[PDB]
């Protein structure tokens, strides 16, 4: 069977052949309770203390228990379950090439990474998950240490020169949908530049940026509160046109115009934005070591090994013991080995042939400490570091939680219509909520004046 | 796209890697989450204590 | 009066997310229930449901 | 194809070098 199947894709042999031959069999959860399952064929059947010696079935491979997001975790069994679950949930938030034909899609909120490299250590299971063709991270030279201090409570230090060279540099698209319709017998919308004379309702923004057709041309600079579509509705006309959301500051990629089912002019426009990795961006490894970039140093400042290899990320050492993510360290070591040798390594969950000692022995055959530690130098002064830092390649991701999409502020913004209080939401330009717990805290402080200011003066003065 | 070659898929502004199996309503990818429930036509004997019955044969 | 969330928007933020979303389940039990038996990873979920992947919020 | 042959040669070599296996970092369950 193994031979006839290894010669598949050439003749015709497939899974159905095995199922028909009677070598595999589908067992459902309700039947699984009455079969003496066995993990591996060889190990659990040779001859030993008579445990059961009546096995009926035998699992294909234990790691196959894992799911989709979990499988991409290398060495999952070397980590505490909560961190595995955190990685599983975070993987879905990783950026990268989400689909090959992305330049044709007009979806909303699409991120794409420039150089989505492939993991230096891939599990045998992801070969079918298709991860290697559409990766979601870059292999960075991570050095676990506390260089300066800006990476102490679950934070990292990235390399400014790396970012300059295009390290984790991604792009952010934002699509827009807008079409004309017959509002009423007298009401009617139409694309046309709202001039300063005929249109009564109008915004205090630039309109000549777009062409006469009313659709901003591709490859044009835009900023917050700028007109993107020149929609005007006749009452003489009211400027019922949409504007780019505040704090977007993008460039128009392409403009699509067509007819919807109703037959009216329906147009979509997407704006791209080159998001340079800056501090406050959230990163995460494949082991649940989330974090936010604290500060960025230039290559001249980052530390360096006996040769010019400066780390690209520096996580806090203290994140390791409490969380028990030894899998991350194993990944780093095997990644160093894989880089030196020149081929991708294996990290299948249960392999029985991948221990730390053998990996260390291999690594020792390239002039590196068998445990992966190396001697760095203080980037500032150039004095060796007494402690031998632990530096090696490791696969890191980038989540979409950019800082610029969360930063917000307010100073007497728009007010609601029902209760004259500030709006809610960053997009609507609202103010934060001063919750009952905050009220209680202020009462405890006894700052009655401050409490009354927050609740009356800057909330909704009225007489 | 039933059993259609990657050539045609590429020419139709689609990729062969898309898993598929998701509807398109109003130009939005809608996916049906697989709900779960109790198997039908099977007798269950629960022992609810917060009630007047010692045992309940639900079916 | 009917259920909610049965049909969701396919999260096309990355291929892994697409696969996970296309292969997801959802229990009909009320959100944020006081009980804790249905949430716990039951033994029978061996090789059927990933024991690691799951949200970490109220659900 | 080269990877497949590499894996097969690695497997046969692992089978061949069956002299001794004394390693600290590895273990397996043994019930009863």
């Amino acid at each position: 069977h193994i031979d006839q199947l290894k010669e598949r894709e050439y003749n015709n042999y497939s899974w159905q052949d095995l199922v028909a031959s009677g070598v595999v069999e589908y067992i459902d959860t309700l039947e699984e309770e009455t079969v003496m399952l066995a993990m591996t064929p060889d190990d659990l059947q040779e001859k030993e203390v008579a445990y059961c010696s009546t096995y009926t079935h035998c699992e294909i491979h234990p790691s196959m228990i894992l799911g989709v997001c979990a499988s991409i975790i290398p060495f999952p069994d070397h980590n505490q379950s909560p961190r595995n679950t955190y990685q599983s949930a975070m993987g879905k938030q990783a950026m990268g090439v989400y689909i090959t034909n992305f330049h044709v899609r007009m979806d909303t909120l699409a991120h794409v990474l420039y150089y989505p490299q492939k993991p230096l250590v891939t599990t045998r299971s992801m070969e079918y998950l298709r991860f290697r063709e559409l990766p979601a991270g870059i292999n960075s030279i991570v050095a676990i240490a506390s260089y300066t201090g800006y990476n102490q409570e679950d934070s990292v230090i990235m390399n400014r020169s790396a970012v300059d060279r295009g390290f984790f540099r991604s792009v952010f698209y934002r699509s827009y949908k807008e079409q004309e319709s017959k509002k009423g017998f007298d009401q009617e919308e139409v694309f046309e530049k709202p001039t300063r004379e005929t249109c009564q309702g109008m915004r205090h923004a630039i309109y000549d940026k777009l062409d006469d057709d009313g659709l901003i041309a591709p490859g044009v600079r835009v900023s917050g509160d700028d007109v993107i579509i020149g929609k005007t509705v006749t009452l003489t006309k009211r400027d019922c046109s949409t504007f780019l959301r505040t704090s977007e500051t993008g460039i128009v990629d392409q403009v699509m115009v067509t007819l919807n089912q109703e037959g009216y002019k329906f147009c979509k426009i997407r704006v791209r934005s080159v998001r340079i990795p800056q501090i406050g961006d959230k990163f995460a490894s494949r082991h649940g070591q989330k974090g936010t970039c604290g500060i960025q140093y230039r290559q001249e400042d980052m530390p360096f090994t006996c040769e010019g290899i400066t780390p690209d990320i520096i996580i806090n050492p203290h994140a390791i013991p409490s969380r028990m993510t030894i899998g991350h360290l194993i990944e780093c070591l095997q990644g160093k080995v894989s880089a030196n040798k020149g081929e991708i390594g294996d990290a299948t969950p249960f392999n029985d042939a991948v221990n730390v000692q053998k990996i260390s022995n291999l690594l020792s055959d390239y002039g590196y400490h068998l445990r992966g530690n190396e001697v760095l130098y203080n980037g500032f002064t150039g004095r060796k570091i007494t402690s031998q830092i632990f530096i090696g390649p490791t696969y890191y991701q980038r989540l979409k939680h950019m800082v610029d999409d969360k930063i917000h502020s307010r100073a007497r913004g728009p007010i609601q219509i029902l209760n004259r209080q500030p709006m809610e939401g960053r997009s609507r330009d609202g103010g934060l909520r001063f919750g009952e717990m905050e009220r209680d805290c202020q009462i405890a402080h006894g700052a009655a004046q401050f409490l009354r200011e927050r609740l009356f003066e800057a909330s909704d003065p009225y007489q | 796209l039933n059993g259609l070659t990657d050539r045609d898929l590429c020419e139709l502004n689609e990729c062969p890697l898309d898993p598929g199996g998701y509807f398109i309503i109003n130009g939005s990818e809608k996916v049906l989450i697989a709900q779960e429930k109790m198997a039908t036509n099977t007798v269950y004997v629960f022992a609810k204590k917060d009630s007047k019955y010692a045992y309940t044969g639900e079916c | 009066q009917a259920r909610a969330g049965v049909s969701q928007v396919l999260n096309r933020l990355t291929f892994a997310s697409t696969l996970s979303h296309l292969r997801r389940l959802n229990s009909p039990i009320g959100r944020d229930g006081k009980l804790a038996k249905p949430r716990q990873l039951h033994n029978t979920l061996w090789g059927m449901v990933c024991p690691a992947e799951t949200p970490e919020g109220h659900a | 194809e080269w990877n497949i042959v590499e894996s097969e040669k690695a497997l046969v070599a692992e089978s061949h070098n069956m002299k001794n296996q004394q390693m600290d970092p590895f273990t397996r369950r043994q019930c009863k």
Partner: peptide, 28 residues
């Protein structure tokens, strides 16, 4: 003939065949 020891490689050929014949979303 049984496949002793030399089974790590042969264990994944069946998996590859399965994932080739049936896709990830085959149930839907």
């Amino acid at each position: 003939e049984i496949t002793p020891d030399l089974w790590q490689e042969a264990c994944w050929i069946v998996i590859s065949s399965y994932f080739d014949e049936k896709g990830l979303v085959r149930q839907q």
